[PDB]
Design a protein around this nucleic acid. Sequence first.
RNA 1: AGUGGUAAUGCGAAACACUGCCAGGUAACAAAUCAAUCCUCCCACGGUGAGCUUUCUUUUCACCAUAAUCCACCUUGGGCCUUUUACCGCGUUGUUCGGAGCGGGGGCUCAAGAUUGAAAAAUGCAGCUCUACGUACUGUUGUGAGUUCUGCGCAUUAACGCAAAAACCUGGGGUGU
RNA 2: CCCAACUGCAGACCGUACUCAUCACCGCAUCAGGUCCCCAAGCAUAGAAUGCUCUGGUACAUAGAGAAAGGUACACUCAGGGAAGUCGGCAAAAUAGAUGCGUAAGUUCGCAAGAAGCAUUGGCUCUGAGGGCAAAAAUUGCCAACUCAGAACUGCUUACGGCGGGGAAUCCAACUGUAUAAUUAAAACAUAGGUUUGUG
RNA 3: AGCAAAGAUCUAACGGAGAUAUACUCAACAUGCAACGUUGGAUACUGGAGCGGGGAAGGAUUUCGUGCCAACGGCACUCGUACACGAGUUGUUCGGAAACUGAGCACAACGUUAUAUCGUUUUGUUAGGAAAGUGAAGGUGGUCGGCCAUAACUGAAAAGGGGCAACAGAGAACCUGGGAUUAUAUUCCAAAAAGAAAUUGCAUGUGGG
RNA 4: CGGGGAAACCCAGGUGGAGGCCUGUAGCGAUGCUGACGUGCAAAUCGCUCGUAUGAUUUGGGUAUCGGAGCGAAAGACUCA
Lengths: 50, 126, 121, 63, 59, 76
Amino acid sequence: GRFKPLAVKKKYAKKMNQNKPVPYWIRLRTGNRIKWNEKRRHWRRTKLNY
Amino acid sequence: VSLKLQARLASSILGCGRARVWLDPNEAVEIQNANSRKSVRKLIKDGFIIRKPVKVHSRARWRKMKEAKDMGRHNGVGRREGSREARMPSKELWMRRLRILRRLLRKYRADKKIDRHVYRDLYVRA
Amino acid sequence: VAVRAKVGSRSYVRQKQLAKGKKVFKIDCSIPAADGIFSEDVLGNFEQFFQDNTKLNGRKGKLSDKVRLSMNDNVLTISTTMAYRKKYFKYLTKKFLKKKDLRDWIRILATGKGTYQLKYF
Amino acid sequence: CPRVQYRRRMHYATRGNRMKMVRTPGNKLVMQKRAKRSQGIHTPWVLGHKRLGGTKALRHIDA
Amino acid sequence: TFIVDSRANKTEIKKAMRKLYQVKAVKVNTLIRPDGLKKAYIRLSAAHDALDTANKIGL
Amino acid sequence: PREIKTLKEFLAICSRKDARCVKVKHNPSATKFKVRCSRYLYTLVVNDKKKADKIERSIHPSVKKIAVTARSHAKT
RNA sequence: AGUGGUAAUGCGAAACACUGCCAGGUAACAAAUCAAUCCUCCCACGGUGAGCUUUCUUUUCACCAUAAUCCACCUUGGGCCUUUUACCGCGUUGUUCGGAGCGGGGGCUCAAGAUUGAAAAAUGCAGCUCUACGUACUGUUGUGAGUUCUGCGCAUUAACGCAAAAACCUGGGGUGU
RNA sequence: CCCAACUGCAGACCGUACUCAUCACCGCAUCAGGUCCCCAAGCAUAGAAUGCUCUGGUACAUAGAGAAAGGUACACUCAGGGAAGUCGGCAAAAUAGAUGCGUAAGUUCGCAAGAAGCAUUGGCUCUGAGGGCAAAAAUUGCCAACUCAGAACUGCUUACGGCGGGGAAUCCAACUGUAUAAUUAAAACAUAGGUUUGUG
RNA sequence: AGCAAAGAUCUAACGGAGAUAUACUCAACAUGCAACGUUGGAUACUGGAGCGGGGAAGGAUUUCGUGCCAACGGCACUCGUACACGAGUUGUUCGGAAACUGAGCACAACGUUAUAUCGUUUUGUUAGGAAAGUGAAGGUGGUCGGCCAUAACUGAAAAGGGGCAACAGAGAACCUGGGAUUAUAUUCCAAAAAGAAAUUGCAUGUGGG
RNA sequence: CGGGGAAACCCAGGUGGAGGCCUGUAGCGAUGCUGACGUGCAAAUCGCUCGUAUGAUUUGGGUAUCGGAGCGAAAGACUCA
Ligand SMILES: NC[C@@H]1O[C@H](O[C@H]2[C@@H](O)[C@H](O[C@@H]3[C@@H](O)[C@H](N)C[C@H](N)[C@H]3O[C@H]3O[C@H](CO)[C@@H](O)[C@H](O)[C@H]3N)O[C@@H]2CO)[C@H](N)[C@@H](O)[C@@H]1O
Ligand SMILES: [Mg+2]
Ligand SMILES: [Mg+2]
Ligand SMILES: [Mg+2]
Ligand SMILES: [Mg+2]
Ligand SMILES: [Mg+2]
Ligand SMILES: [Mg+2]
Ligand SMILES: [Mg+2]
Ligand SMILES: [Mg+2]
Ligand SMILES: [Mg+2]
């Protein structure tokens, strides 16, 4: 809805900026470990509940 | 191919509804590069998008039926489906009558046809 | 509404004559006549079609001294003292104009407060 | 036959809300809000809670 | 339009649009975005051109 | 918005420092002199078409006169 | 140092200016009945466009808009004043009222509207006409039905009696003296 | 120094997208479950019943081809008989709106009662009543919106939807109400009424 | 086994790799079927207790444009609430807070407890309980025509400490028009603000005591 | 308002709109089919029928009462399947 506290809005804003994939040049480093992001949250599969 | 963005913007510029906008099926090329409300307003002005008129809902079959019912043609006993005191409430028939009687008695007393002793006798009997 | 109607009284109805008089409805037939289509065989029936089918007090084809037509230069001019509608002679033109298959060539179109104009598309 | 929405973030038919249903110059029904009214200036409750004469019913800033 | 810091008010954004940029803000309309950042729409005083300021900034 | 009664009060309002513009609206019956001051919009309704043009000539020097027309959508 | 009207109570460009203390009112609440506002629906008038036409249909459908905010002030429901005193009368659809002042005659007020205007045509919509989201013109009833806004409360069935406070308003008393 | 009408300047913070559900929430899921509020058109009709329609929305829920048996249905009929079926009229049938008449025993006199049981109902063309506001005004003018009764004439294949079957007794609880979410809604529980006890 | 409630789809033209897909001596049917999106047209449905238009709780980018089809949308997909990329939420007046009280809560104080993580704490109201830091009137001495107003001593009068708890109660100053969006608007619109207002704080000037 | 009566009082026609009244939507329940489903749409649902629907009525948000305890028109029912 419309009401949220700003401290809940700023937690919901962090998770939008974390919901981005691994870039391709990460996959080209020397001691690489990361193929995919393992933390890709989708709004329907798993709920944050802030 | 997909004229879905120009069909959504046309319903909100013409203000009508999607079953009532008419996009020209021939000029699917000139419509699909609209991309703005300014461009769809040029297509509405050019005759490539229009508002169609609404579908008809005619009262002519009711109006002819009312002219029968004003002469009392479809109001008999088999056609009456609800109660007597719902079609005409007997409180409404009493209120309408008693207001006619009291307005007449104020009319004849103000015209001084009757006396205030005659008024008060005929008021409580009404 | 005050007195009940009768079914037999639907022959004659009340047209409600004007108090002052002379409400005049011109119909300009200049574009379909001079530019071909309407000859002086149909334009002589266009002045006839209103004298034959305009209703007056419910009855058809019996107007006498209440509707007058008189046919000006290219204009059919309906002068009347009975309360007709301007929207009635747009209707009564389209019946004539449908009867001769001319209602895909000609628009009747409002120009002034008391005149029409048959024009092409 | 035109159907209207609330316009002022509150959507409950309380005595404070009481909307007014008006037609605009752009030919649309909107939903405007009726002001609450005052009962008016009164005589004390212990003297018969009666409305004074010559005094107007003015609510909060119109008073 | 600027991203500003999210803990400024509209009064101190106008005063920063005077000291940095030699223009006069008549109206600021701030907006904390779903990104988390505060965005301000800053209308100039019609004695100052918006493109002439935006070329000097360069954008 | 308010309304001016006489002409002695119209010329006092057009002498004011806040009066940005007088808007002149020619109705088919009357004319309207709509002085836009800083709080209210004052309107003088002159019903006579000949006395209206005489009133326009008395607000010549340094107040802004505007002929109100129907601005189309294309000016935007 | 406010001031008119026997009186109900009136008069606001800037003194009819201020509030230690006090007392009221507002906020502040309530059925059903009847009357019902904005608005909706219908009908009636017409204008513009559209739809139908072998026949019929003075025809069917769409549209016909007016926001806040001011300003000036005809109704129909409350309260009251003054004058005549009346004890049968006035009044409601309805369970009632009157020498503790009915009814008439004149009034003062309050509440809900109506009306003229400023806004506001410059806007809106639908048409259409002319050499490009272009222009010039043309149009802007109802003793019908439904409406809880209101009338409306010391106001409901009741061994049911229907929140509070901030904020504000007026007075008393004082100052101005 | 007080005040009026005006003017001059400034008017800070947070929310604001989208959803609110036969896909956006909860049930593990885009689950026939659940989930508070506002606006609410036409015709039939007593009508927020029910049936259909302009506005808005939709054609999305795996489809195609297609006479098995057997199923399941918010699907029907069935001659003669008419509960003989069965633990049991379970299931279906039947009754049905409205108006006029009529109605028993019992009774706490309030009811029982829509008791029971009879009759009428269309379409059409008319005739009567039931009113307003504008000038023996006990009468001349004009006009809206409906409702009921009567009358000829004419037709029925008894023909949408919606809508009690009824009666005679016995048991139990007075009544409306509550009540084992997910096998028991009862005669249980509550109830008013009655009594008792403790207490200054 | 099944993918059987919520009636239902048909047509042509385009789009698309998804066709009209053939070793001979074959005219076509009998050897490329099925399925997708968009617009037009036809046919229906929902039927205003709506597969309408907005809100709370809940969700938190699902919004919007553009690409795109690996996996997901139990059939299908060229579609998507999927995926990638880029955007998108504008307020003096709207909702909240600043700033109300209610059912209640329990900080301070006091008591208790081996232990505060316990109790009391609205029946007008804390605490064996000196919780008022505000200030009438006057005195002191720079200001305005015996009244004000502005600065520092003395002292009438006010018992009963703080803070929460209502986005449906109280309170609350803005309304239309817009050609202003791809997406926001009673929020954006700048000199003819499309405009018309209301309100708060502070200030000049004019005028009045 | 009318009628009867010497009186006590009776008799009739309206008015009025009372009720934990009745039929019946929504809402709130859940009687019967011992219907459908029973590796379901569903760890309790679907369908028709049924109870009630101005009241001891339904409901949102807020608050207050819990583990040998809470609350209970009482079924050992309910206290996050
Ligand atoms: N004060 C006025 C009086 O009214 C009287 O009028 C009264 C009588 O004419 C007549 O009285 C009747 C009467 O018919 C008969 N003899 C006796 C009967 N009881 C009365 O009946 C009266 O009382 C009964 C109550 O019982 C009421 O129901 C009813 O309203 C009324 N009619 O009805 C009238 C009352 O309404 C006489 N004119 C006279 O005594 C006198 O003028
Ligand atoms: Mg009422
Ligand atoms: Mg579901
Ligand atoms: Mg038999
Ligand atoms: Mg199947
Ligand atoms: Mg239908
Ligand atoms: Mg799939
Ligand atoms: Mg994504
Ligand atoms: Mg019942
Ligand atoms: Mg037991």
